[PDB]
């Protein structure tokens, strides 16, 4: 089994080459592709890493694992471009190009995610449809976008711990969960019990990194240290970390990447 | 048997009720859903109409025809929101609503049906090719990187920006029946190509920088439109009365 250094190198190289190959040349789209590529290519590929790690846990990395990892990275990349837009937050894609270009590159990166998952080379349509459903629920009104919406609508108010958790679970939690769920599903071998453990793993890790982030900033608006005290936020990170690892303990050596990734993502 | 007014009323109420029902309630998304619904509802619903009409040409309207018509309308609706942005509620909401309407189009197509998943994947592929880097978005990008171009360049822009979704509508409609044959798709492609071009020529004529009337004269351009409309009809007339909706739609898209 790969240690974290090797596993991150392997999966980053793997998803990067695959994205490059699938983003096929198309002359009318030259300008569009330039902007798309500028955004897809830095970043640490956390979501691809989780996807490949989960596939490895329960079976073997497959063509649909590549499609999932790449689709998830495309969704993530699109969300970052649209998030840097002046109307939201604020060299970014709209700085290097313009705002109009960044908007279209984001839109196209979303469509590319679905292109990745519906490639004709796949002969597993029922599984592809399932992965598409997974991505839809994580990325749209049931997930990521609703989280961004909540974040925007909450910027003047001070929200409760429950509201803060709800916001993060949608805004960043859902795609993290889609990563482990889709990875495992893409093997064609995952059992419902394994998927439930991965759910809980992902939930814990997703929240823990947001809590840890607020703790890091500490060294107006709602944060975990303000809601729980610095001590309470630190304890929560430790508890979530322990919970995440406990969910995958019974898998043995195959769980090492997910264990290593827990520490890395959290910090 | 149905006339256009009737077909329009039938399809618009049908796609609107399907959209409303499929956009299921979800409390955390309340604000987002408000924005989406505000965008999803006026409009002529040309793409749904083409989808249902194309399904009727070759077979029976099915639940996948509904998903298709609704998915196409959500793509079109998101594209209008993003098109209206200053760079081209409030601005941040509009961006998110557009993004969510795109995801909702894929929700619609991937929702459980009785149909084979192979067909659902095909429909998704058609929507992808029409909407993304291979179609609509590249059309919009070309339009941006253009503010003096030739007819050929203008044509290319329109074929992507507008033509691709029109073609997707007729292709997805027929495919969604589960009964389309390849030669029928080739005919629908030719129909879409003809009406799409006729629309652009007519769009140059109305208005009276490369244009069709500059090339051919006003009479020459008018003649070409009548010709393209006839070509579009010629692709579908062999289906008899089943071709009525697409026939009426051709008369109507060309104004
Ligand atoms: Cl299905």
UniProtKB/TrEMBL annotation, chain B:
<protein>
    <submittedName>
        <fullName>Geranyltranstransferase</fullName>
    </submittedName>
</protein>
């Amino acid at each position: 089994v790969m240690n974290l250094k090797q596993f991150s190198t392997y999966t980053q190289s793997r998803v990067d080459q695959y994205l490059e190959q699938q983003l096929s040349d198309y002359a009318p789209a030259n300008q569009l592709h330039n902007a798309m590529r500028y955004s897809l290519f830095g970043g640490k590929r956390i979501r691809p890493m989780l996807t490949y790690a989960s596939a490895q846990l329960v079976g073997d990395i497959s063509s649909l694992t590549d499609a999932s990892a790449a689709a998830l990275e495309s969704i993530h990349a699109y969300s970052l471009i649209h998030d840097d837009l002046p109307a939201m937050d604020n060299p970014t894609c709209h700085i290097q190009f313009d705002e109009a270009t960044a908007i279209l590159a984001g839109d196209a990166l979303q469509t590319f995610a679905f292109e990745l998952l519906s490639n004709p080379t796949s002969a597993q349509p029922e599984l592809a449809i399932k992965l598409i459903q997974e991505l839809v629920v994580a990325s749209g009104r049931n997930g990521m976008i609703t989280g961004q919406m909540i974040d925007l609508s909450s910027e003047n108010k001070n929200i409760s711990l429950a509201e803060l958790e709800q916001m993060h679970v949608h805004k960043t939690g859902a795609l993290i969960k889609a990563s482990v769920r889709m990875g495992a599903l893409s093997t064609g071998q995952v059992k419902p019990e394994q998927l439930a453990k991965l759910d809980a793993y992902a939930h814990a890790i997703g929240l823990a990194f947001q809590v840890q982030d607020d703790i890091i900033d500490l060294t107006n608006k709602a944060t975990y240290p303000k809601l729980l005290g610095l001590d309470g936020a630190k304890a929560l990170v430790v508890r979530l970390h322990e919970q995440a690892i406990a969910q995958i303990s019974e898998f043995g050596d195959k769980s090492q990447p997910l264990t290593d990734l827990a520490n890395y993502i959290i910090d």
